[PDB]
Amino acid sequence: LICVNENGGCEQYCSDHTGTKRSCRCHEGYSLLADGVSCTPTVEYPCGKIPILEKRNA
Amino acid sequence: IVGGKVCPKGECPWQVLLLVNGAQLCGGTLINTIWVVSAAHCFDKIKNWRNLIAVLGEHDLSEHDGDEQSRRVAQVIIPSTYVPGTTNHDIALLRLHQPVVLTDHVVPLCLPERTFSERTLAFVRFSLVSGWGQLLDRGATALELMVLNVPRLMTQDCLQQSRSPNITEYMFCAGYSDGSKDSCKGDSGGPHATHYRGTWYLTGIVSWGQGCATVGHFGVYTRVSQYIEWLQKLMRSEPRPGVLLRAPFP
Ligand SMILES: Oc1c(-c2cc3cnccc3[nH]2)cnn1-c1ccccc1
Ligand SMILES: [Ca+2]
Ligand SMILES: [Cl-]
Ligand SMILES: [Cl-]
Numbered sequence A: 001l002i003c004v005n006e007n008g009g010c011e012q013y014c015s016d017h018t019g020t021k022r023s024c025r026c027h028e029g030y031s032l033l034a035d036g037v038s039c040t041p042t043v044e045y046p047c048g049k050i051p052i053l054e055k056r057n058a
Numbered sequence B: 001i002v003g004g005k006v007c008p009k010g011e012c013p014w015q016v017l018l019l020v021n022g023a024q025l026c027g028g029t030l031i032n033t034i035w036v037v038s039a040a041h042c043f044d045k046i047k048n049w050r051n052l053i054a055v056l057g058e059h060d061l062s063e064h065d066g067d068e069q070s071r072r073v074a075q076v077i078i079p080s081t082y083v084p085g086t087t088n089h090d091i092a093l094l095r096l097h098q099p100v101v102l103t104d105h106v107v108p109l110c111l112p113e114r115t116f117s118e119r120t121l122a123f124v125r126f127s128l129v130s131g132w133g134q135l136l137d138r139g140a141t142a143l144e145l146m147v148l149n150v151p152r153l154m155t156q157d158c159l160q161q162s163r164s165p166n167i168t169e170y171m172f173c174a175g176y177s178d179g180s181k182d183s184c185k186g187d188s189g190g191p192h193a194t195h196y197r198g199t200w201y202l203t204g205i206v207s208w209g210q211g212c213a214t215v216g217h218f219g220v221y222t223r224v225s226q227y228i229e230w231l232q233k234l235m236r237s238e239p240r241p242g243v244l245l246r247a248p249f250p
Helices: B114-119 B155-161 B224-235
Strands: A013-017 A021-025 A030-032 A039-041 B015-020 B023-032 B035-038 B052-056 B069-079 B092-096 B126-131 B146-153 B171-174 B191-196 B199-206 B219-223 B244-247
Touching (some): A013 B114, B015 B035, B023 B191, B035 B224, B114 B224, B155 B171
Parallel strands (some): B069 B244
Antiparallel strands (some): A013 A021, A030 A039, B023 B035, B035 B092, B069 B092, B191 B199
């Protein structure tokens, strides 16, 4: 997998590494899941999420 | 904002209102608890830097509902490459005197990594632009926060479809050429926000140019991706005396 294509399968940020290697990363206030691609909030008010809407569907 | 709709209260929680002596100046975008991104040109005419206020959690300007948070602006940082009264490098980073408190009504927009922004976000067609700007060319400003979905154009296409300052690598075009829908005076500095896989990111800043919702023309936005590294470095730096700071770019 490569970052330029389909975001390397990452939900958020992506880094290419030496080889057929890729690492996904997450913004502050998020953590990476064991799938190695998904990001989950770690705080109450993570960036780029709309509380009244997140609640609306919770 | 021309041809938009009211942003339901709390659905644009990163939106900032900038005031000078209590008067509407510009918009901005909250990117963390003490940092706001706006447009350089907003500060072209500022005489007394100490009269600058940022308001978070604002919605309806006619009332006070208790969700609003006002802060003094401690620093206004502008790139060295910005020339007053022009369009290129139209970006400013503002340091608040005290952090805002995150709430259901006050939340930062994510400042993306450059690579992500360039490789992925830049290809998301539609994005949201917001503000309390003019509702019409030569019209009154909005009392309630407005929002508009605009499509992004490749610069080549922008130029082709247009019928003026250049469109540089530090800009992009978005909107409509039919004079129905645009950002407008009073909106400058505000966010152009892009959704990807359940999260919103800062991709542009409402800049300026020739008329608002002028037939044959598109809106011009500062291309935030060009500035990520510049912004990040500044956010890691200590404040300096005196509000205005010109910082080398790149
Ligand atoms: O921001 C503006 C505009 C403006 C026009 C326009 C068109 N389309 C989109 C955005 C736009 N902004 C005009 N004057 N100022 C201004 C100048 C000095 C300080 C604060 C504001
Ligand atoms: Ca209010
Ligand atoms: Cl420093
Ligand atoms: Cl000063």
